[PDB]
Design a binder for this molecule. Structure first.
Ligand SMILES: Nc1ncnc2c1ncn2[C@@H]1O[C@H](COP(=O)(O)OP(=O)(O)NP(=O)(O)O)[C@@H](O)[C@H]1O
Ligand SMILES: [K+]
Ligand SMILES: [Mg+2]
Ligand SMILES: [Mg+2]
Lengths: 529, 88, 88
């Protein structure tokens, strides 16, 4: 298709217009007291929000060249949020500040290549100072504070998240799930869950709650089919003459097996249920031991899969609490053999963690965290489905932000961390005048988010910034400005803290996208229509 | 009434902002005034005595129709204080 | 300084008038305040003692130029109190 190319200063002017239009709408929502942004909904009432992430998601411009700058900053700002939770609005604010100041320096005749070198050097100094300012998380007190700040300053969400981390542990998984309840609740279950549920709905004990939990279950996992009448009747009759509650796990589902169990359930002879075949491939071996963690019996595998039945003293399979859903099942309790196969827990902690470098940790954690003590589910409740949507997304980000805080530490919030880090740029010196300009660009940018927060709350930004700078020497580095109430206090003591990962990623990502746009020389886009 | 009040507050609020007032401080004053007004409204209110006030409220709630007010007042009397009245 | 003061008075006066204040009474209040301010200024005044204050005043008025201040201080000393200084 025919394309139009824009060169040089004209190309950067288009990017500046797009970045400014995106940043101006987003930056007004920064802080705990951001201004409202109204978004049109087709054939419905308008949506009023202060999220910033919601505003950025709806931003798109007709001009392809202005859209280039908006989408480039949006993609980088989203990457900051994905890695460490919060930081979408802060990265956008920082990116605009660096880009606008960089263009002004270039317009005065400075070398763009030397400016980028000064920008890179300043960012490295700022990042190092951020690490020095950070402190490790102590316990539940800081975890609760981080979760509260990560959300819309909601204490109820922060308390729920902090409790979820306490119950789950330091290496589990916290899941945020759907609900229709009028209030948000925390659901914690011991053991591990399975990605699949009912094989047949006839097993349901009570249709109103649709639950068919089995007491003292004797589960039968099979690495072979073992689902015909010949394959099951000696297993069934041995179970029948033993009375053990029956759970059948096989390679696949059989119509013959379910038909006789539904008849048996109607007759009530045997406590039969099935969870088809969760997992794939070598994941079975982990699943084989997962039940062996709790029932204390050896895995059937294919050894007992052959001979049509487990003949030797194998697979006791004696649990005491198993849950079932439509596409979910949880094995909760049993006689227990956790310590014996804790060597495999040690093994995966020793082996699979060693091979994490291929970025397969998502598969390992999806196995290790389930194989851990237990998991917790966050239950979300709101007024409308639309109100339910952004609250669920906000809770997930708060959980991710809390995890990042534990990984790297916390820093004082409200933009104080960047202000303290920017103070070390005063002593940083270079032999090139243009590189010095890039250093001053970052110093000005680092002090921008604190002014924006003060401006949004209704205070003069430069007055607040001057007071915060003075309080760094008079009181301490952790002293800053609170935006919920217009007074200065110790942010760390007050609980207004941010993960140090969020601050570190936001400044690095913003400087990265701004640097590329500063040296951009051509924009290629198709001619519309 | 809500639409009339909303326009009055919005129009006067914009005039104050146009003169240089802080919008955040304007909202704080608006919130404080509303709390005082609501408290005074509760003080001014009186409990409903019986059928006389119920009939009057129903008449005013409709287009000042006495027939509708009488019918509604009778419906509350016959049904009771905790039932349901259906319009068909 | 006079222009800066004039803008400040007008801007603040507009805010007061926008709140419903009487413009005539605001002007009367402004006149009373200025009389107090002028009287306080006269009390704070200090008479000129000699060449030191003359040179300091000339230097400040010349945008911190010591060369101009020295020349003007010499000019006043030569012509005395009744002299006239011309700039060409
Ligand atoms: N009470 C407070 N006083 C001062 N600063 C605060 C306060 N609460 C939060 N902050 C700061 O405000 C910023 C968070 O505001 P927010 O608008 O969520 O920014 P973001 O996290 O970059 N955007 P999003 O990704 O949409 O959450 C952080 O820098 C917090 O430290
Ligand atoms: K906000
Ligand atoms: Mg946030
Ligand atoms: Mg009416």
């Amino acid at each position: 298709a025919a394309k139009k190319v824009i060169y040089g200063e004209d190309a950067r002017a288009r990017l500046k217009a797009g970045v400014d239009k995106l940043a101006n709408a987003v930056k007004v929502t920064l802080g705990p007291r951001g201004r409202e942004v109204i978004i049109e909904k087709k054939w419905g009432t308008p949506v009023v929000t202060k999220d910033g992430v919601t505003v950025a998601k709806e931003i798109e411009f007709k001009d392809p060249y202005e859209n280039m700058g908006a989408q480039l900053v949006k993609e980088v700002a989203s990457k900051t949020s994905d890695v460490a939770g919060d930081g979408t609005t802060t990265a956008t604010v920082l990116a605009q500040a660096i880009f606008n100041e960089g263009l002004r320096a270039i317009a005065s005749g400075a070398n763009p290549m030397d400016i980028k070198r000064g920008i890179d050097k300043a960012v490295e100094t700022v990042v190092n100072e951020i690490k020095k300012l950070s402190i490790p998380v102590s316990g539940r007190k800081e975890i609760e504070q981080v979760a509260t700040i990560s959300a819309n300053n909601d204490a109820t969400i922060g308390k729920i998240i902090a409790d979820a981390m306490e119950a789950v542990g330091k290496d589990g998984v916290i899941t945020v799930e759907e609900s229709k309840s009028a209030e948000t609740t925390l659901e914690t279950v011991q053991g591990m869950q399975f990605d699949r549920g009912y094989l047949s709905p006839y097993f349901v004990t009570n249709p109103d709650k649709m639950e068919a939990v089995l007491e003292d279950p004797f589960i039968l996992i099979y690495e072979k089919k073992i689902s015909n009448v010949k394959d099951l009747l000696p297993v069934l009759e041995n179970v029948v003459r033993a009375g053990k509650p029956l759970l059948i796990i096989a390679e696949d589902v059989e119509a013959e097996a379910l038909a006789t169990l539904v008849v048996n359930h109607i007759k009530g002879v045997i406590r039969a249920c099935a969870v088809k075949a969760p997992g794939f491939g070598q994941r079975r071996k982990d699943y084989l031991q997962d039940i062996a963690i709790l029932t204390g019996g050896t895995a059937i595998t294919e050894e007992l899969g052959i001979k049509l039945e487990s003949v030797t003293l194998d697979m006791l399979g004696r649990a005491d609490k198993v849950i079932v859903d439509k596409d979910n099942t949880t094995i909760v309790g049993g006689k227990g053999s956790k310590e014996a196969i804790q060597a495999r827990i040690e093994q995966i902690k020793r082996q699979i963690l060693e091979t994490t470098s291929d970025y397969d940790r998502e598969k390992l954690q999806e196995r290790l965290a389930k194989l851990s003590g237990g998991v917790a589910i966050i239950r979300v409740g709101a007024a409308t489905e639309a109100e339910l949507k952004e609250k669920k997304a906000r809770v997930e980000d708060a959980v991710h932000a809390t995890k990042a805080a534990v990984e790297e530490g916390i820093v004082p919030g409200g933009g104080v961390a960047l202000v303290r880090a920017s103070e070390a740029l005063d002593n940083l010196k270079v032999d090139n005048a243009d590189q010095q300009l890039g250093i001053d660009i970052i110093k000005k940018a680092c002090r921008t988010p604190i002014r924006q927060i003060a401006a949004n709350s209704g205070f003069e930004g430069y007055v607040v910034l001057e007071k915060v700078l003075q309080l760094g020497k008079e009181k301490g580095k952790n002293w800053g400005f609170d935006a919920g109430v217009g007074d200065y206090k110790d942010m760390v003591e007050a609980g207004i803290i941010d993960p140090t990962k969020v601050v570190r990623v936001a400044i690095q990502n913003a400087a990265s996208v701004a640097g590329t746009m500063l040296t951009a020389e051509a924009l290629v886009a198709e001619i519309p229509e």
